[PDB]
Amino acid sequence: NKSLPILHEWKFFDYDFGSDERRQDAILSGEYDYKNNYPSDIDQWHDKIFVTMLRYNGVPSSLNVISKKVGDGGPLLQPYPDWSFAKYDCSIVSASKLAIDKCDRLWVLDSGLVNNTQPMCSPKLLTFDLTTSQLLKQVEIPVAVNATTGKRLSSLAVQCDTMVYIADEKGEGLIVYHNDSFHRLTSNTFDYDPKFTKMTDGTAQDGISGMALSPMTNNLYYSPVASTSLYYVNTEQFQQYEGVQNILDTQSSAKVVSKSGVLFFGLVGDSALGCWNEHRTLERHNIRTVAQSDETLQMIASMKIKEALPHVPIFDRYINREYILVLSNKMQKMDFNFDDVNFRIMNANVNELILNTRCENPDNDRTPFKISIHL
Amino acid sequence: RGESLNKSLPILHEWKFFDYDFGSDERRQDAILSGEYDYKNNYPSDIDQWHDKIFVTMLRYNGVPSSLNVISKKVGDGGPLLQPYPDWSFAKYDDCSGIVSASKLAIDKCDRLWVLDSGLVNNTQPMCSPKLLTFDLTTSQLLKQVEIPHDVAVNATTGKGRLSSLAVQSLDCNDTMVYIADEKGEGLIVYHNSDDSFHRLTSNTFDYDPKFTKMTIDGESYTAQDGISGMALSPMTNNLYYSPVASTSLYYVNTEQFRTSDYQDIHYEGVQNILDTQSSAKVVSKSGVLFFGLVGDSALGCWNEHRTLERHNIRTVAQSDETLQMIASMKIKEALPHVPIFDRYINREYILVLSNKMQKMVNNDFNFDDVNFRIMNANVNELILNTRCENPDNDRTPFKISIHL
Amino acid sequence: NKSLPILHEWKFFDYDFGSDERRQDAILSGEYDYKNNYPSDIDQWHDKIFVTMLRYNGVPSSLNVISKKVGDGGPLLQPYPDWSFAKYDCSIVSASKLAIDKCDRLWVLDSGLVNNTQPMCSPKLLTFDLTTSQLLKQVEIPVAVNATTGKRLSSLAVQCDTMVYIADEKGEGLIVYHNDSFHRLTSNTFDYDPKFTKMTDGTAQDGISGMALSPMTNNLYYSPVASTSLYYVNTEQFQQYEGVQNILDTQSSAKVVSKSGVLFFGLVGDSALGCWNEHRTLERHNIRTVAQSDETLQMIASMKIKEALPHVPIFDRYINREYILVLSNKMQKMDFNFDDVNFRIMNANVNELILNTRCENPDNDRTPFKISIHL
Amino acid sequence: RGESLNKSLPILHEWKFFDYDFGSDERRQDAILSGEYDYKNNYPSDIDQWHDKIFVTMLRYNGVPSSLNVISKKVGDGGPLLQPYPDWSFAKYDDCSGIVSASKLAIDKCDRLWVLDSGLVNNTQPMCSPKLLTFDLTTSQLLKQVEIPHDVAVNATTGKGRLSSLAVQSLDCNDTMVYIADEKGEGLIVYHNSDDSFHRLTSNTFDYDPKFTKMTIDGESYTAQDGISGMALSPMTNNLYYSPVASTSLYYVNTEQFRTSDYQDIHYEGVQNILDTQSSAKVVSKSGVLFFGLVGDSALGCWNEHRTLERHNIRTVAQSDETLQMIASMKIKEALPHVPIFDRYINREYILVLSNKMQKMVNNDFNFDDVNFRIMNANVNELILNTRCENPDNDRTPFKISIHL
Amino acid sequence: VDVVSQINSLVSSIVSGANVSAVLLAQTLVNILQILIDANVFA
Amino acid sequence: DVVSQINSLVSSIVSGANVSAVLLAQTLVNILQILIDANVF
Amino acid sequence: DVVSQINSLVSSIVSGANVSAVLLAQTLVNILQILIDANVF
Amino acid sequence: VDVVSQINSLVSSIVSGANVSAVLLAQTLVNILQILIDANVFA
Ligand SMILES: C=C(CC[C@@H](C)[C@H]1CC[C@H]2[C@@H]3CC=C4C[C@@H](O)CC[C@]4(C)[C@H]3CC[C@]12C)C(C)C
Ligand SMILES: C=C(CC[C@@H](C)[C@H]1CC[C@H]2[C@@H]3CC=C4C[C@@H](O)CC[C@]4(C)[C@H]3CC[C@]12C)C(C)C
Ligand SMILES: C=C(CC[C@@H](C)[C@H]1CC[C@H]2[C@@H]3CC=C4C[C@@H](O)CC[C@]4(C)[C@H]3CC[C@]12C)C(C)C
Ligand SMILES: C=C(CC[C@@H](C)[C@H]1CC[C@H]2[C@@H]3CC=C4C[C@@H](O)CC[C@]4(C)[C@H]3CC[C@]12C)C(C)C
Ligand SMILES: C=C(CC[C@@H](C)[C@H]1CC[C@H]2[C@@H]3CC=C4C[C@@H](O)CC[C@]4(C)[C@H]3CC[C@]12C)C(C)C
Ligand SMILES: C=C(CC[C@@H](C)[C@H]1CC[C@H]2[C@@H]3CC=C4C[C@@H](O)CC[C@]4(C)[C@H]3CC[C@]12C)C(C)C
Ligand SMILES: C=C(CC[C@@H](C)[C@H]1CC[C@H]2[C@@H]3CC=C4C[C@@H](O)CC[C@]4(C)[C@H]3CC[C@]12C)C(C)C
Ligand SMILES: C=C(CC[C@@H](C)[C@H]1CC[C@H]2[C@@H]3CC=C4C[C@@H](O)CC[C@]4(C)[C@H]3CC[C@]12C)C(C)C
């Protein structure tokens, strides 16, 4: 029953157009309607906090960072790298998901979708150098559609010879890229379950969507959106499965794994955050809920886990380095009340969240002090 | 109990057996031959801590050179050597002049060390009258010494007495109140610094229960017909928590009752038979968390004073069949120096735990090739975090530092 | 009889052309003959040490800095700002003298002369911003010639509304610029003396050349090259004189004044450095020689005085801040022996050089420590 | 002399008159009434310095509570109060037990403080026999005390004696050699630490010259028929420089002569009549620069040992008619701590100068509303830089730090 | 005053991987020390 | 061991004990050098 | 006065005396603040 | 070893007005301290 400290809040999103002159030119045009801006993913690198927006009608830029400027809605966004990549007339159409690797490359999953459905352009995977803010490589996703159903690239994971993984919730499959082959996989574990299609604050026929790669085991955990199961596939395989079914009491939302082997996941029904340690066996008595809030955790659309910096390995024993960033929009409302707070980036120290619970990693209490970190 | 089996606390000091800094191995051997120092008869009663000093008190059996000690820089095959405090002058009791058996210790806001000398030898034969000493820790010199009158040191009918527990309430650094439990005689002495007055209280809550007289620790068991001990004053509520040794209850008395004179109808509170086993020593954090040793389980339990006193608010926070066999003492300290502006960044409170093996003393059957006496420690907040014992966490800084020694 | 610590030495000058390929292309061409490279002025700003070269035949660049690279001759030079300003075909022809002001502007006196005589282009005063390495202003010197004799801008001083002063040794006059008027002045004190035209290691009919502005008194000290006198003119005057004549026993070379009011000057005959405090009266018993060396101080062609940085005025009492940089070429040899050391930049702490001599400023010994600085 | 008229040295401590830390103004007044302390009769003989202590020795006239002192933290209308060293125990001479009149001090490599107690009262009447004390500065306790036998303390024919100068040669920190000038009796005592042996030497170089017996300081003049004083041992050459008080000469004796025994034909060196006025106290830097006070000019002069001893190598380095009237003492110290790798960055040596006004003592005509006694100081290298006294400067670093107190 | 928000801000920079202002580092070091001085940490 | 020095030093500080200036200096030296070697600057 | 503190402190150090940790800390604080205010960083 | 040439180099940078390397500053601080430690400056 923890609340997690808020890092950023919004009543609604707004952007740094330049002057209030240049904003009003966009409002009248319908380039920017505040009522249609919904965040898809967040991430963090140095001083930058990325926020991606689902490209509906009235969404000026998709790939953004939070700026120094502030509005009545909350922190204004600012397109990344510049406004050049905000344009789609198929030039980033809709930055669905983000990922940052060991080498300071930012991977972006552009779905190509408009209103999250009509595919105006083909999907692609971009790769920016965060040191320069310039683009290193762009690749079209052919892999991209079911080849039978015909059907939304809605999850991403990246492994400095790197390997990317892209879930397709609508088409129900797993694209596997090699740094230049692509390959679509399929499974019944990737398919949606009709039983858990209804997610009742107060229906979605989507499959594989909620991926999370363990840095310690190399299992890519996942589940269909309509499911109460937790499946996984080992990635050492990556030319053609594990996990329990119906293990959770409600549907899971986004997912993330710590370097230390703790899997976190959002619990849709309870409006809570749950965890599970990979060292334990996947069963009910090892699944615990670690935070919950009826106001603040309504749909956990994204989670990332970062390590405190700089990384000086000799001092690791003194520091609980890992912390979690949580995007909690209100997908249930996507009929909003824009006089209230709707979109939140929360955070917390990982170890503080699970300590003295079945989720914890074993504590060697071998120093007179331990420092817990977050932002 | 959950999610905490075999969770041990980091060791600060270990011993196979106690030994002292006599000077050189010449001066030691002079004492071994004399019978002043037999290593097999040294059993620790209490610990405490102030600045660089860690106090260790020894039950004065035959072969125990000093009772009131500190841990020294020197080290032996047994473990850290002890060194009498203040000097060897207070180790002597042929004279019957100063300190026979430092049963318990307490340190107050003003850097005074309070010592409960029982006067007992072999924990039974009262060679001298009990007394309460008060040293100035800044100087290592004695400020005051007071005899505990036989009037209140023993039960009047039976004549029995063993002063086994101590707690101090420094109200104003100058009007302090001491509290002394008598487990054998079954009473609560209440001393006043202003008058040097004493007052012995009685209650059925101070009496031993025959039902819970058998206590099993690590296979071996023994029997103890003892009452009130394991005292602990809450700095936040002023409740002096206690229980009879042979009991599974947690009682308490509010001490505001003792402030206004004329009490000598006192009101005792607390649940009976609330624990599954007997409780040993006890301590309360400034933040209102009560810790207590669970004799049977060889565990440490807690309970927050903010919650209601019942089973569903009692949790066991550490347990170890090897390391926690009899928790004979516990103290809680705040990290120093105290810079209040930075309190928000720091979990300041930590716990020190003396865990001898009283079960092995009873039967006179120790294995001195093994580790027997341990001072463990831990950060209070880290021990209770995400448990029913915790205080509500304001997560208001990008970092939090947990401290112990 | 002090020697001063050497900061940089040369047997001969050489440049950073790029590769030894690009050097050899210039040697063959006659763009760079090592035997014709003679330094005119030095200066210093942050990590840069400026070295200006008299533009004879075989001198690739005139305005240079010392580079990180090294040759058999000594530190290679590198044109400032880039090779763009090394070109003259009248685009810097010959950077005769330099000066740095309070605001980090570098003033350059381009004479326009080739072989120090034939005026290929008109003289000019450039002004670079040292923060950017870019040019702020360029001005042609009309003022520039005698208007009767017809005749070499060979001395410079700069006072953030700034005032520049340019001596003309050949034409015998003093140009005064206002930050945009110019104005040539004349005097018999600016004229050469035939008596001291011969400067005998083992003849020059030149006038005003050896200027030095006192930061404390605003006197611009000077003398004709052929003279043994020390004249001066107050600059508060600056629309149409002071100092003793024949006060020195031999001819003076370059000149510089400390912020603290000590005038330094090279003594041609003795191959020495002399000083004189402005607080004392200008006469023989107040003139002292502070350093001398038959090898190292043969012609003091330039001197500058800098203050140690950063400038934190509260701590001035702890620090002898001022130090002197001395260019000592061998103008007597301008018949050189290029297997020997010919051009030297020496330095020293000002206060250490004059302490307990008639040149010193009064010492308040009011701290348990005093730090002496140079490079 | 040139380029240095009225150049003064920064004052470290000033006095209008000396006063002591008796305890409180209660305890002072008890001594004033007694005649133990008259402020008008306190005249400083020597200074020295070790760590935080500045020693100040007082000529034991009537009304001088202690002879061997340090400067205290307390301050009076006269100036810094003095405080007896080690304690008041050594201030007493009714008993004749310890320290009558600490004439001179010396500190050696091993942190021993050597004290030359003359035994004189009013600088004339020998109430007790002279002695040489040796305290350990680390402990403030006394290591050794030795009487100077009447055999060598006085001239055998005339019987006169006044031990007025001291120098110490710590050869090995354990075999040290002390040297004690006797200005009245005209001799040089040479003591050996190994034997406790003494040997009195004589020479015409030790004798007073009637020609230079009149010394004028700041208008007022007096007359002094005194010989050998103003000693100073060179740490680099082992020459013990000296001169008779009534003389304008600078003599010296090499001390390697005294190393090999059997001397008691000794060879004395140095120019005669080399100065225009009389020299007062003397000191030599480790670097080989000899400093000396010039009585007539009220100046400080120097001479480098590397140069030849003659007029053109002697320069006056500071002078002041107010502040330098009689240079009664000088010492040279190196800045600490000593970190040899950084020696190149630091002019380590500095000079301490006691400048009382002996001219005003002679005539018993002080003005105690004025400043009378001064401890000045300066960096050695800064004082002699660009003068004939300097040692050659290797200018090999971008910075050089000059030190004094 | 307001050392807490400076500290919080600065540590957040450091742990985030960002480049950290030397002046903010110096000023916060100055303020932490002075606080410690005033709390007799060195006395 | 840098770790044992750190542990020892912090234990002193938090215990209220007087803290060794040499242990303080040496541990500061070792932490810095570690940070230097990790390109922290 | 920062100057009097500096003078006092350096005199201690060079004299061989034990040197006050509080005077050291406070003077370090004042030198830094001066440097901060002079845009030295 | 060769702390002297590092010191000389570093101070020359500082006094010249140049920007000064944080790593050279840190390393030279480390070396000066260690020298002082080995000379019992803190003992
Ligand atoms: C209590 C404090 C401040 C404590 C400060 C010095 C703590 C806090 C966080 C620490 C960094 C955390 C992680 C890390 C990651 C590790 O890899 C290097 C150390 C570093 C940067 C810590 C350094 C020390 C920090 C800044 C004041 C109020 C007295
Ligand atoms: C992580 C580190 C070192 C971290 C150091 C600076 C931390 C640790 C403990 C902190 C004190 C704890 C309590 C306290 C109690 C509080 O009252 C004052 C701060 C103080 C003393 C902390 C100061 C900062 C300390 C010493 C290295 C290895 C990179
Ligand atoms: C003796 C030393 C090094 C001493 C160091 C700290 C000295 C030397 C020069 C000083 C700067 C000079 C001028 C100045 C100009 C003044 O405005 C600010 C201080 C500064 C930069 C000095 C700072 C202190 C410096 C760097 C080691 C070997 C123990
Ligand atoms: C200019 C400064 C402060 C300069 C400080 C760091 C200087 C001054 C004296 C130096 C010591 C002198 C001698 C010595 C003797 C030598 O043996 C060790 C260095 C030491 C202690 C110097 C260390 C550096 C000191 C303290 C501020 C006002 C900007
Ligand atoms: C600017 C910083 C670093 C702050 C650092 C230098 C501060 C913090 C606490 C200080 C120690 C506290 C107590 C003590 C106890 C005292 O006995 C010695 C100093 C020491 C260890 C302090 C030294 C300096 C510390 C570690 C962060 C915010 C990036
Ligand atoms: C001796 C100490 C105190 C250790 C202190 C001075 C250490 C610890 C961490 C260091 C910072 C790490 C990162 C950083 C981030 C980097 O950008 C600047 C330096 C800084 C702040 C380090 C400086 C020094 C710190 C604060 C303890 C053990 C008692
Ligand atoms: C307390 C002290 C020591 C004072 C020391 C830490 C001060 C003095 C000068 C400072 C540097 C000045 C310039 C600079 C140049 C700048 O670029 C970096 C900081 C630095 C090196 C300053 C840092 C701190 C210094 C060395 C004395 C009085 C005993
Ligand atoms: C990196 C620097 C600055 C070096 C500075 C921090 C060093 C130098 C000497 C140190 C003091 C020496 C003695 C002592 C005496 C000792 O008792 C306390 C420390 C102190 C004052 C040292 C502290 C730190 C000093 C000032 C320069 C080269 C830019």
Numbering used by the authors:
A (entry chain B), C (entry chain B): 28 to 116, 118 to 119, 121 to 171, 174 to 182, 184 to 191, 195, 200 to 218, 221 to 241, ...
B (entry chain A), D (entry chain A): 23 to 196, 200 to 289, 292 to 432
E (entry chain D), H (entry chain D): 36 to 78
F (entry chain C), G (entry chain C): 37 to 77
Paper passage:
RJ contains 12–15% protein, of which 82–90% are members of the major royal jelly protein family (MRJPs) that share high homology, and are designated MRJP1−95–7. Besides their nutritional role, MRJP1 is a key factor responsible for honeybee development. Interestingly, the MRJP1 oligomer reportedly comprises both MRJP1 and apisimin. Apisimin is a serine-valine-rich peptide exclusively found in honeybee and has the tendency to form oligomers.
Because, the sequence homology between MRJP1 and any other protein of known three-dimensional structure was <17%, the structure were determined by combining multiple isomorphous replacement and molecular replacement methods, and refined to a resolution of 2.65 Å in space group of H32, with an Rwork of 23.9% and an Rfree of 27.5%. The asymmetric unit contains two MRJP1, two apisimin, four unexpected 24-methylenecholesterol (ostreasterol, Osl), and 144 water molecules. The overall complex adopts an H-shaped structure with approximate height, width, and length of 100 × 50 × 115 Å, respectively. It has an apisimin-dependent dimerisation of MRJP1 dimers quaternary structure, comprising 16 molecules, including four MRJP1, four apisimin, and eight 24-methylenecholesterol molecules. MRJP1 is folded into a unique six-bladed β-propeller shape containing 31 β-strands and 11 α-helices with a central channel. Three disulfide bonds (Cys132–Cys195, Cys118–Cys150, and Cys329–Cys416) were observed in MRJP1, with the last one stabilising the C-terminal portion. Each apisimin molecule in the asymmetric unit contains two α-helices connected by a loop, with two hydrogen bonds and a large hydrophobic zone between the two α-helices, giving apisimin a relatively stable 47° oblique structure. For the inner two Osl molecules, each is totally enveloped by two MRJP1 molecules, one apisimin, and the other three Osl molecules. Apisimin functions as a dimer joining the protein complex, stabilising the complete MRJP14-apisimin4-Osl8 tetramer. Interestingly, electron density for N-acetylglucosamine (NAG) was observed at glycosylation site Asn144 in the crystal structure.
